[PDB]
PDB file of all heavy atoms in Angstrom:
ATOM      1  N   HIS A 166     -18.885  30.188  -7.613  1.00  0.00           N
ATOM      2  CA  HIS A 166     -19.619  31.332  -8.155  1.00  0.00           C
ATOM      3  C   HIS A 166     -19.432  32.583  -7.173  1.00  0.00           C
ATOM      4  O   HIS A 166     -19.218  33.667  -7.589  1.00  0.00           O
ATOM      5  CB  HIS A 166     -21.081  31.122  -8.430  1.00  0.00           C
ATOM      6  CG  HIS A 166     -21.731  32.126  -9.124  1.00  0.00           C
ATOM      7  ND1 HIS A 166     -22.599  32.942  -8.460  1.00  0.00           N
ATOM      8  CD2 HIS A 166     -21.524  32.452 -10.457  1.00  0.00           C
ATOM      9  CE1 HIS A 166     -23.092  33.862  -9.452  1.00  0.00           C
ATOM     10  NE2 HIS A 166     -22.467  33.568 -10.562  1.00  0.00           N
ATOM     11  N   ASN A 167     -19.575  32.231  -5.886  1.00  0.00           N
ATOM     12  CA  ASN A 167     -19.513  33.141  -4.862  1.00  0.00           C
ATOM     13  C   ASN A 167     -18.026  33.823  -4.884  1.00  0.00           C
ATOM     14  O   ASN A 167     -17.915  35.017  -4.836  1.00  0.00           O
ATOM     15  CB  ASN A 167     -19.723  32.522  -3.377  1.00  0.00           C
ATOM     16  CG  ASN A 167     -20.976  32.373  -3.094  1.00  0.00           C
ATOM     17  OD1 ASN A 167     -21.952  32.858  -3.788  1.00  0.00           O
ATOM     18  ND2 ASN A 167     -21.383  31.625  -2.111  1.00  0.00           N
ATOM     19  N   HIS A 168     -17.113  32.923  -5.037  1.00  0.00           N
ATOM     20  CA  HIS A 168     -15.657  33.359  -5.162  1.00  0.00           C
ATOM     21  C   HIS A 168     -15.396  34.310  -6.273  1.00  0.00           C
ATOM     22  O   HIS A 168     -14.867  35.473  -6.057  1.00  0.00           O
ATOM     23  CB  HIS A 168     -14.720  32.151  -5.129  1.00  0.00           C
ATOM     24  CG  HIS A 168     -13.238  32.371  -5.343  1.00  0.00           C
ATOM     25  ND1 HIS A 168     -12.486  32.438  -4.294  1.00  0.00           N
ATOM     26  CD2 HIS A 168     -12.625  32.779  -6.318  1.00  0.00           C
ATOM     27  CE1 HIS A 168     -11.259  32.753  -4.626  1.00  0.00           C
ATOM     28  NE2 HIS A 168     -11.353  32.919  -5.966  1.00  0.00           N
ATOM     29  N   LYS A 169     -15.876  33.870  -7.372  1.00  0.00           N
ATOM     30  CA  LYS A 169     -15.811  34.729  -8.652  1.00  0.00           C
ATOM     31  C   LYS A 169     -16.396  36.078  -8.530  1.00  0.00           C
ATOM     32  O   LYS A 169     -15.787  37.096  -8.909  1.00  0.00           O
ATOM     33  CB  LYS A 169     -16.453  33.966  -9.915  1.00  0.00           C
ATOM     34  CG  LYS A 169     -15.631  32.884 -10.392  1.00  0.00           C
ATOM     35  CD  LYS A 169     -16.284  31.785 -11.256  1.00  0.00           C
ATOM     36  CE  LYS A 169     -16.507  32.308 -12.709  1.00  0.00           C
ATOM     37  NZ  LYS A 169     -16.631  31.104 -13.550  1.00  0.00           N
ATOM     38  N   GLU A 170     -17.621  36.053  -8.030  1.00  0.00           N
ATOM     39  CA  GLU A 170     -18.284  37.235  -7.777  1.00  0.00           C
ATOM     40  C   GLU A 170     -17.642  38.213  -6.811  1.00  0.00           C
ATOM     41  O   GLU A 170     -17.505  39.408  -7.019  1.00  0.00           O
ATOM     42  CB  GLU A 170     -19.733  37.160  -7.402  1.00  0.00           C
ATOM     43  CG  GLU A 170     -20.589  36.526  -8.572  1.00  0.00           C
ATOM     44  CD  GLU A 170     -20.518  37.336  -9.949  1.00  0.00           C
ATOM     45  OE1 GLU A 170     -20.956  38.452  -9.839  1.00  0.00           O
ATOM     46  OE2 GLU A 170     -19.980  36.753 -10.912  1.00  0.00           O
ATOM     47  N   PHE A 171     -17.041  37.741  -5.702  1.00  0.00           N
ATOM     48  CA  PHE A 171     -16.451  38.588  -4.643  1.00  0.00           C
ATOM     49  C   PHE A 171     -15.121  39.130  -5.058  1.00  0.00           C
ATOM     50  O   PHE A 171     -14.789  40.351  -4.783  1.00  0.00           O
ATOM     51  CB  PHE A 171     -16.346  37.662  -3.418  1.00  0.00           C
ATOM     52  CG  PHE A 171     -15.746  38.494  -2.219  1.00  0.00           C
ATOM     53  CD1 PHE A 171     -16.535  39.383  -1.579  1.00  0.00           C
ATOM     54  CD2 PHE A 171     -14.487  38.222  -1.743  1.00  0.00           C
ATOM     55  CE1 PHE A 171     -16.059  40.106  -0.447  1.00  0.00           C
ATOM     56  CE2 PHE A 171     -13.926  39.150  -0.835  1.00  0.00           C
ATOM     57  CZ  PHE A 171     -14.867  40.034  -0.104  1.00  0.00           C
ATOM     58  N   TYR A 172     -14.324  38.394  -5.693  1.00  0.00           N
ATOM     59  CA  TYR A 172     -12.953  38.682  -6.025  1.00  0.00           C
ATOM     60  C   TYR A 172     -12.776  39.489  -7.388  1.00  0.00           C
ATOM     61  O   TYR A 172     -11.756  39.857  -7.635  1.00  0.00           O
ATOM     62  CB  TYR A 172     -11.914  37.616  -5.928  1.00  0.00           C
ATOM     63  CG  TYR A 172     -11.694  37.186  -4.372  1.00  0.00           C
ATOM     64  CD1 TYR A 172     -12.264  36.028  -3.906  1.00  0.00           C
ATOM     65  CD2 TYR A 172     -11.054  37.932  -3.534  1.00  0.00           C
ATOM     66  CE1 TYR A 172     -12.062  35.633  -2.450  1.00  0.00           C
ATOM     67  CE2 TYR A 172     -10.716  37.578  -2.311  1.00  0.00           C
ATOM     68  CZ  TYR A 172     -11.279  36.371  -1.763  1.00  0.00           C
ATOM     69  OH  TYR A 172     -11.127  36.010  -0.486  1.00  0.00           O
ATOM     70  N   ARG A 173     -13.997  39.584  -8.031  1.00  0.00           N
ATOM     71  CA  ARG A 173     -13.960  40.606  -9.128  1.00  0.00           C
ATOM     72  C   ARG A 173     -12.765  40.563 -10.077  1.00  0.00           C
ATOM     73  O   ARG A 173     -12.582  39.495 -10.637  1.00  0.00           O
ATOM     74  CB  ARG A 173     -14.031  41.982  -8.544  1.00  0.00           C
ATOM     75  CG  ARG A 173     -15.171  42.480  -7.667  1.00  0.00           C
ATOM     76  CD  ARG A 173     -16.416  42.238  -8.254  1.00  0.00           C
ATOM     77  NE  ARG A 173     -17.407  43.019  -7.280  1.00  0.00           N
ATOM     78  CZ  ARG A 173     -17.760  44.245  -7.571  1.00  0.00           C
ATOM     79  NH1 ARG A 173     -17.441  44.881  -8.464  1.00  0.00           N
ATOM     80  NH2 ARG A 173     -18.624  44.771  -6.678  1.00  0.00           N
ATOM     81  N   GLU A 174     -11.838  41.483 -10.143  1.00  0.00           N
ATOM     82  CA  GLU A 174     -10.886  41.503 -11.118  1.00  0.00           C
ATOM     83  C   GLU A 174      -9.598  41.148 -10.367  1.00  0.00           C
ATOM     84  O   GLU A 174      -8.526  41.020 -11.090  1.00  0.00           O
ATOM     85  CB  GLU A 174     -10.737  42.894 -11.798  1.00  0.00           C
ATOM     86  CG  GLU A 174     -11.995  43.539 -12.404  1.00  0.00           C
ATOM     87  CD  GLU A 174     -12.767  42.628 -13.309  1.00  0.00           C
ATOM     88  OE1 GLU A 174     -12.364  42.438 -14.460  1.00  0.00           O
ATOM     89  OE2 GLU A 174     -13.832  42.013 -12.958  1.00  0.00           O
ATOM     90  N   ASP A 175      -9.582  40.952  -9.084  1.00  0.00           N
ATOM     91  CA  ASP A 175      -8.440  40.395  -8.580  1.00  0.00           C
ATOM     92  C   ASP A 175      -7.980  39.058  -9.173  1.00  0.00           C
ATOM     93  O   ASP A 175      -8.850  38.158  -9.517  1.00  0.00           O
ATOM     94  CB  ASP A 175      -8.508  40.100  -6.956  1.00  0.00           C
ATOM     95  CG  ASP A 175      -7.154  39.989  -6.282  1.00  0.00           C
ATOM     96  OD1 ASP A 175      -6.360  39.087  -6.537  1.00  0.00           O
ATOM     97  OD2 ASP A 175      -6.989  40.814  -5.302  1.00  0.00           O
ATOM     98  N   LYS A 176      -6.642  38.855  -9.413  1.00  0.00           N
ATOM     99  CA  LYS A 176      -6.246  37.625 -10.021  1.00  0.00           C
ATOM    100  C   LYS A 176      -6.560  36.307  -9.190  1.00  0.00           C
ATOM    101  O   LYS A 176      -6.591  35.252  -9.665  1.00  0.00           O
ATOM    102  CB  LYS A 176      -4.791  37.742 -10.292  1.00  0.00           C
ATOM    103  CG  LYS A 176      -3.840  37.781  -8.963  1.00  0.00           C
ATOM    104  CD  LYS A 176      -2.478  38.225  -9.272  1.00  0.00           C
ATOM    105  CE  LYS A 176      -1.588  38.222  -8.238  1.00  0.00           C
ATOM    106  NZ  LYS A 176      -0.231  38.346  -8.455  1.00  0.00           N
TER     107      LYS A 176
END
Side-chain angles (χ1 to χ4, degrees):
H166 189 253
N167 282 349
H168 179 99
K169 285 161 77 162
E170 293 307 297
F171 182 72
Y172 291 105
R173 306 295 197 98
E174 312 306 285
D175 195 295
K176 67 194 177 170

